[PDB]
Design a protein around this ligand. Structure first.
Ligand SMILES: [Cl-]
Ligand SMILES: [Cl-]
Lengths: 253, 251
């Protein structure tokens, strides 16, 4: 049976899917103005897309920015996410730099969760998951394909490997090229959820064509969904207000 | 291609909303029609099988007239849902065909619903008759216990086209979550390979609700909502249905 994941008092895996929004700021000044602009938006988890932050290799700066968000947004769990260039991110980093950055986030005491990419390297992932858990920081383990939708079987295999590597919440986002691809993503979601999952999972088919996948998580088994405040962090994200509207209708229908 | 009934263009843009009106007497029918005046829907389906005196031709056409007098700006779809497809009363094939012919000849309805499994010759003759009077035909099939394989759902939709349906329609019942996706697969396959007109598909119950919401992407041209009482499992409130369809259209 599926256990839930509680982050800064939000319980993920129960009830209606939770809404995650991404905050993107190049400088400390932008991060602060965006955080202020997000303050009153209707979402559940705040993801900080750190790869949008210039010169992330200056430790003191990343810390300062994290502290700035944490003081403006006091009522939401914070997810620290450096999306690698490999998986659609805005910046290149070495594996070493990537792991150091996430370990720095963990020991800061400022973040509730970190995002770690499944294909970073098994050894590095196991170690960083261990380090996170030792500091009471949850891990969303992710995989993204911005060009195509892999076969359902391959999608399920990846989500299963995320569980094996210790993810608190497995997450996969794929790009549909056809309408059938959207159904392939939902099939994988259902099969994973019904046969192998023992914790919450997050799945999505990107683009306007895949939008339905961001709304039907309650029936098909995705525990959270991404929405946009102003600009999307990945294609297909709709406004958090509209997202909450639909999720509530579906929760009570 | 599209199907235009009055100023409503079916097959274009956001899926159109159909709601069912159910009443046993003329007074019930008037009461419901008045209540529906404010609801936001596109096509009014009269579930004739709920009417208590369907074998009295004078009564049925008075009820239809009553509805048309009240709802003057929406196309009216005349639907006698047979007991064998989950409806409220049983009629012989002859009575059912005669009832639909009388509806067509009345000039009061814009569309009729004919069940695919009525009998090929009777269906062809009634389709021809409706068309001769400029009445559109939604051809339907329902299964309240299971979901046929995708290939059989497609075959049925294809047969509906062959028999001259203006709009093929199929409703199936999911026993599992995978069955909901099977209905959507069949909808996509039909739409992309065989359809040359609008189609309506739905997986019933709350479990299949996605199928009532995602027609713009997957290829269903209309969807049923409920004003106060559902005409089949899984229908959601018409207001909420319009909200979701609009959000999906504007995404
Ligand atoms: Cl996303
Ligand atoms: Cl229905």
């Amino acid at each position: 049976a599926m256990k839930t994941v509680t982050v800064r008092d939000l319980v993920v895996g129960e009830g209606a899917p939770k809404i995650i929004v991404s905050l993107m700021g190049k400088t400390i000044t932008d991060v602060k103005s965006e955080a202020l602009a997000y303050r009153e938006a209707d979402f559940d988890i705040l993801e900080w897309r750190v790869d949008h932050f210039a010169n992330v290799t200056t430790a003191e700066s990343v810390l300062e920015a994290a502290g700035a968000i944490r003081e403006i947004i006091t009522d939401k769990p914070l997810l620290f996410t450096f999306r690698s260039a490999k998986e659609g991110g805005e910046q290149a980093l070495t594996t070493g730099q990537y792991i150091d950055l996430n370990r720095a986030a963990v020991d800061s005491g400022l973040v509730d969760m970190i995002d770690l990419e499944l294909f970073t390297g098994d050894d590095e992932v196991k170690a960083t998951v261990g380090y996170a858990h030792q500091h009471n920081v949850a891990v969303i383990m992710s995989n993204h394909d911005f060009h195509k939708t892999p076969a359902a079987e391959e999608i399920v295999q990846r989500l299963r490997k995320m569980q094996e590597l210790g993810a608190d919440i497995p997450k996969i986002a794929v790009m549909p090229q056809t309408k059938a691809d959207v159904l392939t993503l939902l099939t994988a979601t259902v099969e994973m959820q019904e046969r192998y999952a023992d914790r919450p999972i997050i799945t999505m088919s990107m683009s306007k064509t895949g939008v339905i996948s961001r709304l039907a998580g309650e029936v098909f088994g995705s525990a959270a969904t991404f929405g946009a405040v102003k600009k999307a962090s990945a294609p297909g994200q709709i406004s958090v207000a509209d997202l909450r509207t639909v999720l509530t209708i579906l929760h009570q229908a």
